[PDB]
């Protein structure tokens, strides 16, 4: 869960450069597939297990 965004997956460190105003990233299917961590400001990939 990040900021209320519940889901099951494998987290990984990412090279997707979210700009300062962004918090989540999404795929062509309109689902969140990356999210910056609200405590330490890095971007995490989300992949289904």
């Amino acid at each position: 869960n990040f900021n209320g965004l519940k889901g099951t997956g494998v987290l990984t460190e990412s090279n997707k450069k979210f700009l300062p105003f962004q918090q989540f990233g999404r795929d062509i299917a309109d689902t969140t597939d990356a999210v910056r961590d609200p405590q330490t400001l890095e971007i995490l990939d989300i992949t289904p297990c």
Partner: protein, 36 residues
Amino acid sequence: QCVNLTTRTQLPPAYTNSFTRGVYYPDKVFRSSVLH
């Protein structure tokens, strides 16, 4: 202290062709190598 100026010059303003500017990020979300 708020004194207006008589020196106003009236002339109809020019038009200019704004080519492809004024796009902005439409929502607070990341997307990449995609058409949306």
